[PDB]
């Protein structure tokens, strides 16, 4: 039984944005604060926060606020989900008779 579609929709939508993919690339190297993550990007912080929030809501990252500081870390589950969906299609392709 394939994963329910609603779980995958948001996971893939998160990856459709280059800012979000860049943030995930950084968090793959280890955790970071929002202010650190925002530095490469020419957008106002509210616009950047939309990306952070989307990443958290879709399960790609976890964040924690203490005072004015918000720490972020990558989550591995969505990687597993993407891998799983891909592998399923690739099994169908390689098993063609």
Binding footprint of its own copies on the chain (CB under 8 A): 5-6, 8-10, 12-13, 15-18, 21, 24-25, 28-30, 74, 79, 82-83, 85-86, 88-90, 92-93, 95-96
38: Cα separation from own chain's centroid: 15
Taking the C-alpha atoms of residue 36 and residue 46, their distance in angstroms, rounded to an integer, is 15
Shorter beta-carbon distance to its own copies: residue 5 or 67: 5
> If contact means CB under 5 to 8 A according to the sort of partner, which of its own copies, Br ion, none does residue 45 touch?
none
Longest CA span, the chain: 60
Residue 67 interacts with Br ion (CB under 5 A): yes or no: no
CB of 63 to its own copies, least distance (A): 18
> If contact means CB under 5 to 8 A according to the sort of partner, which of Br ion, its own copies, none does residue 33 touch?
Br ion
Tokens representing 29 are 């190297």
Taking the C-alpha atoms of residue 64 and residue 43, their distance in angstroms, rounded to an integer, is 22
Residue 22's DSSP bridge partners are none
Q: Which residue has the tokens 């924690």?
A: 64
> If contact means CB under 5 to 8 A according to the sort of partner, which of its own copies, Br ion, none does residue 70 touch?
Br ion
């Amino acid at each position: 039984m394939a994963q329910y579609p609603e779980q995958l929709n948001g996971i893939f939508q998160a990856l459709a944005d280059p800012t979000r993919r860049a943030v995930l690339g950084r968090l793959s190297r280890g955790p970071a604060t929002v202010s650190e993550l925002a530095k490469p990007f020419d957008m106002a912080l509210p616009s950047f926060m939309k990306h952070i929030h989307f990443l958290e809501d879709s399960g790609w990252i976890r964040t924690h606020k203490q005072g004015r500081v918000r720490t972020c870390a990558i989550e591995k589950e969505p990687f597993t989900a993407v891998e799983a969906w891909l592998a399923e299609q690739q099994e169908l392709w390689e098993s063609r008779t």
